[PDB]
Design a protein around this ligand. Structure first.
Ligand code: CL
Ligand code: CL
Lengths: 661, 661
């Protein structure tokens, strides 16, 4: 009667329903059928039904236990059949879902499991539009869960069935209400519910209640926990969590158990001073991250989540906006573990500069959106990293006006979880900005026209006109191809096929200086940590890509901007990085070299001869001007001070040719 | 009158001719228009005409000079127009070509350069078939070359115009005939041709001749060079080259100059003992490499060539087969520089297990193939790394029988260059094997059916029946996806959608042991160093990919086999690598762990407790058997001996579940 969790990812048989013959090919999960077409820039990539079928041997000894199929994510509608009989449907591409199959299987034989996944367009399931790909299929894990007939229920919106509600938290004491779903299919009886909080081998809490469970009972039980002088989850400084074991016992035997983290903290956002974690001001040095990657689409493996977090911590990221939808439980686990303050959001996404709408005013759309919000909150309730619930991105009032509906979602979020503030990401003026507790804007001053300086004007004017708003920046960024390089700085056309890397570097340096000076801005999030898929894009070095990443789509190459942020945000790892190394061909008679470093100064050498030292500025940048190259090959080297220095080096070619002038 | 070489890669205007309207988009070279479609597995990817146009300002001061447009590579037919007037055509996707434009331009104004590139199917330009993509477009650099009216000619098959023919080479002395093409468009006159051999600042040779040049003269001049006690290019041990400057002088002024490397060596292949470089036996530890990469197709940048060579040297590669076509001058330069013995080949490729033919018996096909061979030899003549000329890959006699034609190519190769042997890569029995000086076979014993043991039987039986043959292995390999992992070793279906990484590891370990024991095998080349594009493939973890690489297509991930070879071929870099780390889920009650290391033994730890030391075998492999894991997470660590060890580590999950049995 130990709970079992059996992965069912291997060897499914797949075909599209547009293939009428019935032949199938082997696939293995996680899987999307849009990893080739959408990623090649095909705008009308396959959106429709793909069918996955697998034989599952139901063990004779599972008779008398309860059996559940839990899906971590299927985009975007899933219809599940056991022995070809429909058992249920889930509508929504990003939340987990579960079906009990206990009474639906034949014990001691192979049973068919068939999943018919549909990512076809709909007007009743958010997201309706967006600058990303709606990759179809079973792109997260599938599990067979086996439990006692009397269990901690897995059936409440596919959540772990335990909510560790933080009611009061300070360094003196924490009070928590452990709410636990119980489900009984055995005879009427009683059981003992135990909640055990530990830190390593040390017991911190232990609470018990006897509970009466009628046959067919599905009930919520609540146990208070008190922890004196708690160790708090304090972001990257100390991402500490207790372990909580919730178990059911009968006549001296444990019959079921689940574990969840408890990371205690408290926070607030001040309109003038920014974000405070556990009573201390904390600048939120944030980036955004989509759940896709080159070649595999959104069919991410655990090492992919692991590498994305490793790259963010290397850069000194301490905040993340996991846009534009609920992401993997494992990704939120890694945010908990590494101390990253997380903004998690539902996929209520508007059109941006494109056509159509994020909101369609019909009951089916509205009720589904509420179910997606409840899923997000209940499924991910216990992650201390999550400190904001995001309710939308770039909705607009024209046509169907989502204002009243967004007020409904806000009230529902506050009722489900009074312990986190709501937030949203806006690109509009007006009423949509005054609903959520924190507000943020997506700003591209210096990329989509204008100069970075208009970001400063916007922030200052907004803060002065509306002093009660807690203002953030939910997106800012600029495109870059690592293969587009030029000696001189000039602003490219955003929508064109030329995105020189130096303009992205310049964009981030100027925008960051504006942000750094404005502590009323509670958090800022770079769009985006990685290049990502968007099939309709036709810009930069190839179609189908949003190239605003600080790192490329395959996670292989860090663009110059990554190191500018690393020098400024990760000050305890010594480093020096020469900018513009991918610009190998130089034409300008007067060369400028620039390095990012954590050192107070650096020295430049050209062809083995020192050009002398320069001091790092407040933004960890060292600059040498009017450097003279010799025609042909030149070796450029920068070094930090001391007898054991760090170095960076490049060979460039200097050419006096051109073109008219 | 210094020679100028001006890169013309930036900002061309592109459209397909199937787009009849005339609108264009900016592109930048190197460029292929098949980097999205063919790489997504679209079998009928775009094969036809793409048009590139750029305005080129012709400087008034270039009047009186000579002007050439040189193309490093356009796949596969290029028609070039200046001010919309046709100037010439090149047929062949892999060799350089050049057109003089001196008398075709208007000086002091912008002139249009239009290139109409066509990669449409043809039956008169090899390669006609092949297991790779025929990526279309201007995928290598374009240059404007500016010279004196009297110059070292760039017009001999677009070669540098100098052939440093090695006539006798030993450690006592080297005799070289410097053959130099001269071209005069100025008045009848004389000039002084100088050939200067140097090592750093030291002069080793200096020879001069006066030459008489008629107006319109295009002539070949030959100067003998003698070098006493030469330093020889000796592979990776000492890849030494002299620098040669060839210059033309008049009345005390230098008027033109080119430089080429001189890497002196001699070699032979013995049917029983293998390959000898500079009189010393040298096992050729080889891999093959295609000129493509994820995302960019064959539009490779110099850092791509640089990274490919870096990865090969890391693995201890000392030989390379640059299949299946002439590759970049820069790639052969890197082979020279790093000491890698190189097999360079023309694209005379047969069908393998697929339909159609590599040979069509018509004069147009045959004459074009001879021009592609002459291009390869003349353009790449001076690279010491190149030690074999490959004439075909997998032709077959059935239908049009290429035997007589391959004898013609062999005789032409020997006439153009008596200093290198010819070779070929075969998958057939019979006469095709008895034409080139060295012969090699493509073998997949243990992958395309059978067991690796049949490679041993083939090699031994062939060597015994035909003792005069110099036998090599031109391809051997097996597919692997880094995302297909399983606890147990079982042979997969080659053509299926399941290519577990452990089978590739096993394949290479067994095949390498067969090779290592057989010194009569002069060279072996892994197919392939990298996964590569082949649009028609439908196997492994995604369509459109040949996944036989030791490294993935984006060059990011080294598969386990890479480290098996690194431990065995690069013995002077200490290392330890735990195999099967990507296999995170373990089911077998009895676990086996395996490490590759350069150390004589290694120690295993499980959950922090030593399982004891094991000795490395002759193949640098350490193995522990019957290792007991605890249910759930286990930390596995291996370390080399000593107080400062090298380590490798992984966390795996051990699960006692399954499926019937
Ligand atoms: Cl909207
Ligand atoms: Cl053939």
């Amino acid at each position: 009667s130990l709970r079992q969790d059996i992965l069912l990812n291997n060897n499914w048989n797949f075909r599209f329903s547009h293939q009428v013959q019935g032949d199938t090919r082997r696939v293995d999960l996680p899987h999307t059928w849009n990893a080739q077409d959408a990623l090649a820039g095909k705008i009308d990539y396959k959106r429709g039904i793909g069918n996955y079928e697998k034989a599952l041997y139901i063990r004779p000894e599972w008779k008398g236990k309860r059996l559940f199929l839990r899906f971590d994510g299927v985009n975007s509608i899933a219809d599940v059949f056991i022995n070809r009989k429909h058992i249920g449907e889930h509508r929504g591409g990003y939340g987990a879902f579960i079906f009990e199959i206990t009474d639906l299987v034949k014990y001691g034989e192979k049973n068919s499991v068939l999943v018919r996944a549909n990512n076809g367009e709909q007007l009743d399931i958010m997201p309706l539009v967006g600058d990303f790909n709606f990759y179809g299929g079973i792109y997260r894990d599938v599990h067979l869960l086996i439990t006692d007939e009397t269990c901690i229920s897995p059936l409440d919106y596919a959540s772990p069935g335990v909510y560790l509600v933080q009611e009061v938290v300070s360094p003196q004491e924490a009070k928590v209400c452990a709410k636990v779903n119980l489900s009984n299919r055995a005879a009427d009886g009683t059981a003992e519910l135990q909640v055990l909080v530990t830190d390593g081998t040390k017991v911190i809490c232990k609470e018990s209640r006897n509970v009466s469970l009628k046959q067919g009972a599905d009930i919520l039980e609540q146990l208070p926990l008190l922890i004196q002088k708690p160790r708090l989850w304090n972001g990257c400084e100390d991402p500490f969590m207790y372990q909580v074991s919730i178990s059911l016992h009968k006549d001296g035997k444990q019959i079921d158990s689940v574990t969840q983290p408890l990371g205690l903290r408290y926070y607030h956002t001040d309109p003038d001073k920014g974000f405070f974690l556990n009573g201390k001001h904390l600048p939120l040095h944030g980036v955004c991250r989509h759940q896709d990657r080159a070649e595999v689409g959104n069919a991410l493996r655990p090492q992919h989540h692991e590498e994305d977090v490793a790259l963010m911590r290397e850069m000194g990221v301490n905040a993340i906006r996991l846009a534009h939808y609920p992401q993997a439980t494992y990704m939120y686990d890694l945010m908990d573990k590494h101390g990253i303050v997380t903004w998690a959001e539902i996929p209520f996404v508007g059109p941006g500069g494109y056509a159509d709408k994020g909101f369609v005013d019909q009951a089916s759309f509205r009720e589904n959106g509420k179910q997606q919000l409840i899923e997000l909150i209940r499924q991910h309730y216990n992650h201390p990293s999550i400190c904001f619930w995001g309710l939308f991105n770039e909705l607009k009032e024209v046509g169907d006006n989502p204002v009243e509906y967004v007020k409904e979602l806000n009230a529902l979020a506050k009722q489900e979880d009074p312990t986190r503030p709501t937030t949203s990401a806006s690109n509009q003026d007006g009423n949509l900005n005054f609903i959520t507790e924190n507000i943020a804007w997506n700003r591209y001053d210096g990329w989509y026209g204008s100069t970075p300086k208009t970001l400063a004007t916007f922030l200052d004017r907004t803060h002065k006109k509306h002093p009660e708003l807690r203002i953030g920046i939910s997106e800012y960024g600029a495109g870059a191809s690592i293969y587009h390089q030029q000696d001189s700085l000039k602003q490219p056309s955003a929508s064109g096929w030329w995105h020189p890397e130096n303009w992205q570097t310049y964009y981030h340096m100027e925008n960051w200086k504006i942000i750094a000076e404005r502590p009323f801005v509670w958090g800022t999030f770079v769009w985006n940590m990685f290049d990502f898929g968007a099939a309709h894009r036709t810009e930069g070095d190839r179609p189908g890509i949003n190239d605003k990443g600080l790192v490329t789509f395959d996670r292989k190459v860090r663009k110059d901007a990554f190191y500018f942020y690393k020098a400024n945000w990760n000050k305890q790892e010594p480093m020096i990085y020469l900018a513009e190394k991918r610009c190998r061909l130089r034409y300008q008679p007067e060369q400028t070299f620039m390095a990012f470093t954590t050192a107070p100064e650096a020295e430049l050498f050209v062809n083995g001869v020192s050009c002398g030292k320069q001091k790092a500025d407040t933004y960890s940048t060292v600059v040498w001007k009017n450097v003279k190259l010799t025609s042909g090959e030149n070796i450029i080297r920068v070094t930090t001070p001391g007898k054991k220095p760090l170095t960076d080096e490049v060979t460039v070619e200097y050419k006096e040719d051109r073109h008219h002038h």
